[PDB]
Amino acid sequence: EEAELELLRQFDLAWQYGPCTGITRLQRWCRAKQMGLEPPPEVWQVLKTHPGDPRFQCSLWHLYPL
Amino acid sequence: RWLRPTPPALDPQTEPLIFQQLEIDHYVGPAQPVSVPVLRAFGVTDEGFSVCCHIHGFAPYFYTPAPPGFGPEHMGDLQRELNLAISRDSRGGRELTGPAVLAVELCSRESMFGYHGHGPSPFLRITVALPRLVAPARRLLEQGIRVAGLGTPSFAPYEANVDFEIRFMVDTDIVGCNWLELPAGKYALRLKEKATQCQLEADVLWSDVVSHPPEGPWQRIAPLRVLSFDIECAGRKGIFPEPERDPVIQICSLGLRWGEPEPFLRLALTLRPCAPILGAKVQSYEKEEDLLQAWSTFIRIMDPDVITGYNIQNFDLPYLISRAQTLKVQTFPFLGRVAGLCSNIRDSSFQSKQTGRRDTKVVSMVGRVQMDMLQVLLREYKLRSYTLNAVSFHFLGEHSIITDLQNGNDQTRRRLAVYCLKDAYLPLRLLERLMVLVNAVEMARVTGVPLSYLLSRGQQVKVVSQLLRQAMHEGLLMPVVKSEGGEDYTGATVIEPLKGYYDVPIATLDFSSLYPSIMMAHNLCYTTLLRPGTAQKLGLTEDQFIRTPTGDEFVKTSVRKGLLPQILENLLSARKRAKAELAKETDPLRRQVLDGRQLALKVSANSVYGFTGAQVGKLPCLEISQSVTGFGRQMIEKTKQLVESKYTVENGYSTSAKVVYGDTDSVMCRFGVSSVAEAMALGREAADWVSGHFPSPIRLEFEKVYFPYLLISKKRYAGLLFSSRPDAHDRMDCKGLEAVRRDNCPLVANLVTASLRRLLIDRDPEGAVAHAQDVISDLLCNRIDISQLVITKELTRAASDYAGKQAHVELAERMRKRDPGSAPSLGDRVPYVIISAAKGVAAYMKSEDPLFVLEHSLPIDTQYYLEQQLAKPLLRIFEPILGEGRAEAVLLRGDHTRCKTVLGLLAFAKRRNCCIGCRTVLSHQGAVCEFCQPRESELYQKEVSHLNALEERFSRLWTQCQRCQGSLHEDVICTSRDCPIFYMRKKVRKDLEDQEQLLRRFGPPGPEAW
DNA sequence: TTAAGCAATTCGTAATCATGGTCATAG
DNA sequence: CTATGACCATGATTACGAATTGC
């Protein structure tokens, strides 16, 4: 923790995985894996050792009335 | 980056200098030629080199009458006035003045105020060494000691104490933004070892210069250099940025030469490594010290003339200065032209009854000129919101996210830089499109004040300047009268209306430039005001003086010519030339900006008259003001008597006309015919007929024909506008009504405009009633956007708003938990909406910020908006066409439509389902009721045509943001509170969320797993 | 040391007056 | 238990002070 919260914030702004501020984080991870762009096997291995926490399993701007 | 061209081959003993000045400056100096105040003048050549000019040998002075004794006509006492008193008790009278070369001079002059005769009198001219010694001398010659050998017994008053640079410019006939010439052999370039940073540095004596009056070929403008910039900072969540914790991360700059239709420089300086942008240079640094140093070096090397931006004074420059002070970078705050001078932040305030009161900071830059476009908008224009988005929509047509666009990758930083460059580009487009700078240069050339005074001062320095420039040509001196305080006088008359609705044409006749032509054609001035005794015992009344309705006597023009007639005549010809230029444009926005130019010149001419009556001012003469408004009242009642008396049934005409209205310059006479051609013909005959009963330039003129007409009260009416006949109609006129004020809701102003449209153009009251019914019904059914509900009010001086409790003051002074660092200040506008509660004693307890009621979802008081905002303007407008059954008609059109309303313990809802047909709560989830089950195909048919229309509204809105943003492949981030698009795109998601779930009460129309 | 003017319509806010409704006491 | 009187408040209307616009 506090290092796992920057890896996800770095996965969320890389443009080669998609334009993602409307959906979940694991849905975008599986969308890129289907098309197989290059999802890395570390943004998966922190979404498995946690429960349904809203500060891991949510996009950066899931507040913010946009 | 790009440098100025190289000054090749100037030789001073053969060649002159011809350059155009921008700024002047005062400077107390050593290195005297073998006075101490020497003058600086900065400017540009006809090619593009930068020229500093040092001017020597000038010292301030004033005048004082020589008292009638044996002293000031005897040279021993003149030089004894120069000589100091060596006594011990004269330490209060010869120290703070001390040994200064005040000197003694004898001259024969006159005082301005009044008319005593054509004969002058001896005055003493007193020079002083320094400009910062005329204040203690004034404190030592009037209330100080003037016992000096009995030469000047106390007291003799001081006359013509004015400003130093203004006295220089009045002396040598140099005006703002003028062409200046140093002749051959008069100036020395290498006499001044370089202390400033310009290219050419001359060193001249103050009698060598030649001033060219701007006219003919001397009416050009040199190629100046204009810069605009913008900055970005990275803040915390909630917390507004603070110059001791939040770094400056990006600076972006645009630069152009004036006269060329595109820029030539486009630079962006960032603080992490970035990605390239086509059309601009990009440099990157790993520390902020390098970024601030790089910007200071660029601003020294490019060396711009003018610096613009948007809110750069109150946000950008002091943020940069404080941030450079915190990080210990010594070389930043030297931004000016003088090589050894650092810059400093200093507060200032301005207040008037015309613009209100505003408090600004200033930052010192010598040589360079500042033009914040926000202050120009706030001074000239009266708008509803003053945000960059709001004025860019009105004229053209468009913090915590940024901190994670900067802590991310380099394409995010490239997106941030493109956003910042668009921000830094918008005020240039506004400056060149609105004709700001051309009008500022013409104002400085017509009035004679510098170019920095049109952003800091009011309308007094300009009329003082023009009066002094006209006073040197006949030899008069101005006095100092100051009084606190006189009384008011009686203003203008308004004629009593015949209120109602008219449907026969009324023609408008008015006088053009009324008060300046009264002051012109009856020879009224300070310098020809006759005191009550000095007529006596001469008895010549006829054609030597006249008498006014307030009571004064004023000398005819066969003896004197006043000074205010000539200043007014110059201003009137300048406005006439501006209108003659405006009569040949075809573009609409260009036509209104030339209208803005001529409006400004008419405001200047009327502020000449308003100077006289200002008892808190510099020279008031309320006798003149009273004579002006007395002549106004007399002439308008003359107009009304004459118009209603001549064209009558016995005088061969058709119908005796009757005046329905008149307001101090205009007359709205109702003629009787219902043919617009015959009304126009008789109205032109009437205007030209009545004008032949006056001196000149007094003239009445036809202006319009209203058909139909609607008169509600004093200063409240409406009508439809005819300019010609085959030019059928132009537009509506809404004088005073609820559509042009800014104290209300957009909903109410829109309803008033649409009602007058349906009522005056199509003449259908039934569509008007149906329209107002639909507006009220959609209000009560909760389908009206919250853009239409926002009220704005101006937060003025804090003590008047201490005196009585208001709504906007209560919202402003109540801070937020998120941000006690961004809140309304004095002078701005506070927006709010009114929510529903049960505290009926106070409408100042129900007000809330629009963004707070957005994010926290508070309900709206529809009864407040129904009975307090809407109802009474409608009862103003709709009554005069009918009786009081019309009040009952709209309150009954409410009554058929008021019966349809839509809406701790509130969380414990049981999700009670309800029948879609007859609204009966019941156990189970099926949509239809057992009594209303047969009619189910019709109840499914009903409401799927509602889902169908919500689907069509989702798609038109959420793809409009993609075209306003620019991109089709990346996310939208725009929470622009002045866009209707925002929060209208938020509610359709919830309407669709609700209406989709109501149709799943019905089963599915098929399987889905096959 | 520094500052154009006044006439207002108009609506809001506050205060005062009127009118009824509720509670308590007495018969 | 019922009726009458008193008090109390609450609501509505009228009069005054204040942002903006017409000149």
Ligand SMILES: Cc1cn([C@H]2C[C@H](O)[C@@H](COP(=O)(O)OP(=O)(O)OP(=O)(O)O)O2)c(=O)[nH]c1=O
């Ligand atoms: C607008 C305005 C008018 N007035 C006075 C002076 C004017 O002589 C008188 C008439 O008002 P206006 O009709 O507004 O101005 P005007 O008649 O001088 O010029 P024009 O007809 O070309 O539009 O009202 C002022 O004193 N100060 C002002 O700001």
Ligand code: SF4
């Ligand atoms: S909400 Fe959409 S349409 Fe409205 S300003 Fe923002 S981007 Fe433009």
Ligand SMILES: [Zn+2]
């Ligand atoms: Zn039912």
